[PDB]
Design a binder for these strands. Structure first.
Length: 175
RNA sequence: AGAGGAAGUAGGUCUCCGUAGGUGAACCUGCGGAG
């Protein structure tokens, strides 16, 4: 019998108050968003370390910014992965015009560029300053990774988008 | 002005916060800060 306790950000707390995980994976939950903790306790109906770990990864992802839909998608699909990427990792220039210019290049106005990337490589990301959080199958995650590191290198968004399109297409092909 | 003659050229998204206004709890808008 094992228990996992997870801290939350103050951002998502109303959505956390919005609702079921005991029904989902038979694992008793306590919540206290004032100590920012969520307790996940294995009952006699909880069977697997797999179930505890997926509940933990799921609540951490929903806390880290994705919503209930891709969240229960991550719940449902054990193939799906998560990755947290800081913009402060490997860095092309030491100038601290990094964050503003870079994440402007990432989103574009109205999230056009990020959303084109989403509809291309079939992932789900969220952008908040230094962190970007990426969700889905790891190879798509890696394509998006190479895309974004090229974008923060400064490549033309349409150009890297085209390359991303064709690479995603040949990935999506089987033979 | 005149018919003739004769030639040549053809790129800040999402969440949260602090603001000002709106129709007020909420909520919307805009500004300014954090993830």
């Amino acid at each position: 019998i094992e228990t996992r306790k997870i801290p939350i950000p103050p951002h998502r707390m109303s959505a956390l108050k919005a609702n079921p995980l005991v029904d989902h994976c038979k694992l008793q939950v306590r919540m206290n968003i004032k100590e920012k903790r969520v307790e996940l306790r294995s009952s006699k109906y909880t069977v697997s370390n797999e179930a505890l770990q997926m509940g933990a990864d799921f609540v951490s992802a929903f806390a880290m910014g994705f919503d209930i839909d891709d969240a229960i998608a991550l719940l449902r699909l054990d193939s799906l992965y998560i990755q947290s990427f800081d913009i402060k990792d490997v860095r092309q220039t030491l100038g601290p015009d990094a964050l503003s210019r870079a994440i402007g290049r990432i989103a574009g106005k109205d999230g056009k560029t990020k959303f084109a990337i989403e509809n291309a490589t079939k992932t789900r990301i969220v952008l908040a300053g230094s962190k970007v959080h990426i969700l889905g199958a790891f190879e798509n995650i890696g394509m998006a990774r190479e895309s974004i590191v090229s974008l923060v290198l400064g490549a033309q968004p349409g150009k890297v988008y085209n390359n991303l399109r064709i690479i995603a297409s040949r990935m999506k092909e089987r033979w």
